Amino acid sequence: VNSFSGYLKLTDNVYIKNADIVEEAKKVKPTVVVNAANVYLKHGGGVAGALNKATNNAMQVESDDYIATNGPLKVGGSCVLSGHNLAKHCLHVVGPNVNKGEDIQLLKSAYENFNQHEVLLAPLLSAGIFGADPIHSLRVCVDTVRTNVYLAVFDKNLYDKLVSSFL
Ligand SMILES: Fc1ccc(CSc2ncnc3[nH]cnc23)cc1Cl
Secondary structure: OOOOOOOEEOOOOEEEEEOOHHHHHHHHOOOEEEEEOOOOOOOOOHHHHHHHHHOOOHHHHHHHHHHHHHOOOOOOOEEEEEOOOOOOEEEEEOOOOHHHOOOOOHHHHHHHHHHHOOEEEEOOOOOHHHOOOHHHHHHHHHHHOOOEEEEEEOOHHHHHHHHHOOO
């Protein structure tokens, strides 16, 4: 039993809700919140900009030190950093950005990072400003993630479409 509330169950391990991931994280304080990161951990907009804003820019400060030490992530890769006031940990995961020309096949590799964590609150990778089809992202999530994932979808219209079209 966990504290996630109001989710629709899609499969044995995947759950979905129309919710603002920032507000959901602040309420649940999950062990892991997933950020829709880029390789530079520049949290300017989309989910990343919102999460970082909610940390009063502490996420960005921590991220800049991480990059100065380690260099950029790989597309499809991840790193674990602090969750600040939102969660114990933040798993920064880089899905391919279609608006940069990145290989959509890397979306499966990106979701594989979730399997290193027993339970996660997450957005749909590569959705939103990353330019991929969210219906496809949900399919890859369900077919790749084996751990327990609670998906927050900000847009109510998109949430309804994801549920109604789910096979
Ligand atoms: F400044 C802000 C502006 C917007 C929000 C809503 S969170 C959100 N944004 C974008 N895509 C998503 N996918 C799942 N949740 C989200 C929070 C803050 Cl703090």
